Paper text:
We have investigated the role of the LC in the structure and activity of two neutralizing cattle antibodies (B4 and B13) that bind the F protein of bovine respiratory syncytial virus (bRSV). The F protein epitopes recognised by mAbs B4 and B13 are conserved in both human (h) and bovine (b) [name], and are a major cause of lower respiratory tract infections in young children and calves, respectively. Both B4 and B13 are potent neutralizing, fusion-inhibiting antibodies and protect mice against hRSV infection and calves against bRSV infection. B4 recognises antigenic site II (residues 255–275), whereas B13 binds to an epitope contained within antigenic site IV, V, VI (residues 417–438). Exchanging the LCs between the Fab fragments produced hybrid Fabs: B13* (B13 HC/B4 LC) and B4* (B4 HC/B13 LC).
Comparison of the structures of B4 and B13 with their LC exchanged counterparts B4* and B13* showed that paratope of the HC variable domain (VH) of B4 was disrupted on pairing with the B13 LC, consistent with the loss of binding activity. By contrast, swapping the B4 LC for B13 LC leads to large changes in both orientation of the B4 VH domain and conformation of the H3 loop. The VH domain of B4* differs by approximately 10° in orientation relative to the VL domain compared to B4 VH. On exchanging the light chain from B4 to B13, the H3 flips around to include a π-interaction between Tyr100C (Kabat numbering) of B4 HC and Phe31 of the CDR1 of B13 LC. In the B4 Fab structure, this space is occupied by Trp31, which does not allow space for the Tyr100C interaction. In addition, the orientation of the H3 loop changes from the sequence running clockwise when viewed from the top in the B4 structure to anticlockwise in the B4* structure. The area of the interface between the variable domains of the B4* Fab is lower than that for the B4. This analysis shows that amino acids 100E to 100 L of the HC in the B4* structure have very little involvement in the interface except for Gly100 G, which is completely buried. The large conformation change that occurs on replacing the B4LC with [name] radically alters the conformation of H3 and this disruption of the antigen-binding surface is consistent with the loss of activity. For B4* an accurate Kdapp could not be calculated as the assay had not reached saturation at a Fab concentration of 5 μM which was the maximum B4* concentration used in the assay, but suggests that the affinity would be in the micromolar range.
Numbering used by the authors:
A (entry chain H): 1 to 144, 148 to 201, 206 to 230
B (entry chain L): 3 to 215
Write the structure that this text describes.
């Protein structure tokens, strides 16, 4: 069964060096070229380079001065290093096995020859200068117009994922919609949880952040 | 870079096509391939050399090229074909391969649904720290793509906007959110802000006015 597996740190600080290793199984590494590709959070694919089976390493010229790619046949591994990183290097990183034969494909190397016939799992690497950071929790309300008020909490600026959100210690469950987090340009995540409810009822969101050993309860006023 | 439409819908059992467009420097001369990226999963090579399927790719996938365009055609659509599809091509000038931006294919499996939009203004507590975050929460839409436009006093805003990708809800519709991160002075320096969410040509908009909150 052909298989490629990326490994390395999932969180890297800018100006550091991102180092990944690709470990292959089910084929003889020495007999095949292996390429590195990455996919930004929302954007398209960007080809990084190729460790060809002939010993030549091809680089994306836009990144050549920052890229290193090596091959270790005796360990069934190909490696990638990327230096002087910035948040723009946040991406899912893939290694990929090329075919063996002269098609008319340019997908493998930069030049006419082989295509990519097997993809690694992909490793999401996040570039952020931030260390573990507990969230600030802010109340959300629509007080600026129906008869069913919508409330929520903004779980702001935390690292790393995940957080969990409940309302009234879990007694309030219908109407709750907690959303996946966004990664902001500050290097920190934020997410929101919203509750819509149709007169002495109070509403408190309970935010738990295991990595910083923090739990926050924030009362939200449904004015 | 090559250009393909951001999204497409099809029906079970029927035909859909995805076209990728470039110039005579890439697609006119060199071969094009197609990758399939299935939600929350990896890439799969579907086509290489314009028309060829790697072993194990079902023959209802086919590729073609005419002029400066390439096309992936899928017949007898199955649910499992829901994926993001990317074209890849050679480039004469550069050394690298170049890619299209990806076309997200929906195989229609439930009623279409417009997005619900809730827009929250910044909290006083956040404004006390001299920061202002507007939160636009978008839910219950199907198919799972929207585009978000932020406006202040009628002008389009691009900076300090972060929008998540759409994500599946537990009721099988989709959700997303968008954040506009301002300072408190910025927030107060406009008459009104709007989150405009467009879904299949129909836009749903919510507005907050600093003077009222």
């Amino acid at each position: 069964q052909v298989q490629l597996q990326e490994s390395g740190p999932s969180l890297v600080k800018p100006s550091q060096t991102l180092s990944l290793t690709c470990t292959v199984s089910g084929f003889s590494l020495s007999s095949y070229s292996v390429s590195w590709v990455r996919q930004a959070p929302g954007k398209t694919l960007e080809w990084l380079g190729d460790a060809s089976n002939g010993g030549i390493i091809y680089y994306n010229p836009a990144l050549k001065s920052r890229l290193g790619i090596t091959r270790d046949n005796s360990k069934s591994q190909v490696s990638l290093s990327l230096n002087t990183i910035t948040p723009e290097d946040t991406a899912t990183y893939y290694c990929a096995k090329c075919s063996v034969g002269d098609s008319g494909s340019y997908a493998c190397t930069g030049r006419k020859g082989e295509y990519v016939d097997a993809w690694g799992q992909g490793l999401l690497v996040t570039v952020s200068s931030a260390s573990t950071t507990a969230p600030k929790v802010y109340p959300l309300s629509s007080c600026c117009s129906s008869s069913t008020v919508t409330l929520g909490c903004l779980v702001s600026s935390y690292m790393p994922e995940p957080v969990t959100v409940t309302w009234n210690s879990g007694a309030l469950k219908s109407g709750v919609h907690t959303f996946p987090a966004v990664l902001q340009s500050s290097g920190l995540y934020s997410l929101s949880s919203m509750v819509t409810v149709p007169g002495t009822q109070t509403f408190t969101c309970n935010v738990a952040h295991p990595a910083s050993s923090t739990k926050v309860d924030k009362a939200v006023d449904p004015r | 870079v090559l250009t393909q439409p951001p999204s497409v819908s099809g029906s079970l059992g029927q035909r859909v096509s995805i076209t990728c467009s470039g110039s005579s420097d890439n697609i006119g001369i060199f071969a094009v391939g197609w990758y399939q990226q299935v939600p929350g999963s990896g890439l799969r090579t579907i086509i290489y050399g314009n028309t060829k399927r790697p072993s194990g790719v079902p023959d209802r996938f086919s590729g073609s090229k005419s002029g400066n365009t390439a096309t992936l055609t899928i017949n007898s659509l199955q649910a499992e074909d829901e994926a993001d599809y990317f074209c890849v091509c050679g480039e004469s000038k550069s050394a690298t391969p170049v890619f299209g931006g990806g076309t997200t294919l929906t195989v229609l499996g439930q009623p279409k649904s417009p997005p619900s939009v809730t827009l929250f203004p910044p909290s006083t507590e956040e404004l006390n720290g001299n920061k202002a975050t507007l939160v636009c929460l978008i839910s219950d839409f199907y198919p799972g793509s929207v585009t978000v436009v932020w406006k202040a006093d009628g002008s389009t805003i691009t900076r300090n906007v972060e929008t998540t990708r759409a994500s599946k809800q537990s009721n099988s519709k989709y959700a997303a959110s968008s954040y506009l991160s301002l300072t408190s002075s910025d927030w107060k320096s406009k008459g009104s802000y709007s989150c405009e969410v467009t879904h299949e040509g129909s836009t749903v908009t919510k507005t907050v006015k600093p003077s009222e909150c």
